[PDB]
Amino acid sequence: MKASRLYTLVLVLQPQRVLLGMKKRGFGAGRWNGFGGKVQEGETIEDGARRELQEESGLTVDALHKVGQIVFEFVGEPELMDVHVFCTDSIQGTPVESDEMRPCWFQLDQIPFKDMWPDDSYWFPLLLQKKKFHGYFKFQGQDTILDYTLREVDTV
Numbered sequence: 001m002k003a004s005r006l007y008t009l010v011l012v013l014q015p016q017r018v019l020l021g022m023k024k025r026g027f028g029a030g031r032w033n034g035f036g037g038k039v040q041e042g043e044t045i046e047d048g049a050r051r052e053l054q055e056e057s058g059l060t061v062d063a064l065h066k067v068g069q070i071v072f073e074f075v076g077e078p079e080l081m082d083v084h085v086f087c088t089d090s091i092q093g094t095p096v097e098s099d100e101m102r103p104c105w106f107q108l109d110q111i112p113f114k115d116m117w118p119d120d121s122y123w124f125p126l127l128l129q130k131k132k133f134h135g136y137f138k139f140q141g142q143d144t145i146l147d148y149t150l151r152e153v154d155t156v
């Protein structure tokens with residue numbers, strides 16, 4: 001049994017495009033990803049997701065909907081990353097570059113999978129189909145999956 005730390009991941013998914021951020025520094029730098037980060041003490045997971053979306057993309061939203069949960073394990077790290085995944089189609093304002101992220105829209109036939117975390121190739125398609133999911137991925141380093149599980153669920 002391991003301990004796990006809570007993180008959020010937020011996808012702004014519209015009918016024909018999705019907003020991703022190019023991670024400019026830190027964990028997973030150089031990859032397009034959803035917006036998010038560690039949940040802080042006192043806030044709900046959803047509100048932590050809203051906070052990180054605002055900080056990293058400039059977008060304020062009143063609500064997010066939970067679409068999945070993914071646990072990440074890295075060789076040599078005893079702590080698991082428990083990532084709660086949220087979506088919304090409804091945004092106010094324009095995305096703004098932050099120190100952490102450069103936001104960019106992608107058409108839904110141009111999802112940049114080769115420049116995203118490898119796990120996204122497995123669970124992102126479920127997100128696009130408006131399905132809910134639970135996943136687990138064990139990584140050697142940043143590039144290599146050694147074991148994983150992915151399951152569609154009716155309730156996250």
Ligand SMILES: Nc1[nH]c(=O)nc2c1ncn2[C@H]1C[C@H](O)[C@@H](COP(=O)(O)O)O1
Nearest residue numbers: 007008009026027035036037038117119
């Ligand atoms: N394997 C992975 N696939 C993915 O799509 N996002 C990941 C990830 N591993 C971590 N993340 C996300 C979760 C958080 O939004 C963020 C890690 O927290 P910060 O580096 O503090 O933003 O990266």
Ligand SMILES: [Mn+2]
Nearest residue numbers: 036037052100
């Ligand atoms: Mn952050």
Ligand SMILES: [Mn+2]
Nearest residue numbers: 036037038052
């Ligand atoms: Mn943070």
Ligand SMILES: [Mn+2]
Nearest residue numbers: 036037056100
């Ligand atoms: Mn972050």
